[PDB]
Assembly symmetry: C2
């Protein structure tokens, strides 16, 4: 099946549901979230223990997709260590109503592996992901 | 395309990436998370403002899927109001290393709608979801 030819993903970038994002030493982690109303969404980055790292805010013209991007630095301008960081997204509509939105992280498909348990994508920085958890190639 | 016959989803349950879960007045919200190591995972339920509601903990024989279930009550045994609640999952492996895991919520596909923007699933309690964000029918 092309459930095999999904090897064409190798070399490209994908969007997968992830509660965390990753950065190397050069920096930058991007992704998107689906806003259900107009307003703004605040993306909070925490560390291993759960310590505050940085916070981003993005306006939302109206319901729809909304992108985010972390430069890999803390609120104090400091470049954080390469590794995986937790990310939480909270929406606030025009009215003040709050809600948690699912985060989708963008990552490069370094390679694909086909083992006994099906086909898996080896996402750079993030790790492993079953071909299926993919939201789309963007 | 059967990208249309995915109307067979109506009446069944699906697993979709969600940062929140929902409960009616009778109760119960379930879902799953993919543990990357053996240990335990703690699911924390928060409210609209972000107030603590309840916390669940589940052991993990080893890397793999792990299910969760909230009875709709707070840590103090109180039945919370019907509605949407935020859920966060944190893994702790045998060693004490912590990590945030992506949450997938199980919800009944009340119906399917096909509009100008493609086909959408009307998930009971959660709301809307584009056919694609679905992880699988379970």
């Amino acid at each position: 099946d092309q459930v095999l030819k999904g090897a064409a993903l190798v070399g490209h970038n994908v969007l997968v549901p992830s509660a965390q994002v990753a950065i190397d030493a050069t920096g930058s982690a991007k992704g998107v979230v689906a806003a259900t109303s107009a307003g703004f969404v605040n993306f909070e980055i925490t560390d291993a223990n759960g310590t505050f790292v940085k916070q981003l805010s993005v306006p939302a013209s109206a319901a729809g997709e909304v992108s985010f991007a972390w430069d890999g630095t803390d609120a104090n301008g400091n470049r954080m260590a390469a590794g995986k960081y937790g990310i939480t997204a909270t929406q606030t509509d025009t009215a003040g109503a709050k809600s948690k939105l699912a985060t989708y992280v963008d990552a490069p498909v370094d390679s694909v592996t086909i083992g006994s348990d099906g086909l898996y994508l080896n996402l750079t920085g993030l790790g492993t992901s079953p071909l299926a958890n993919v939201l789309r190639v963007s």
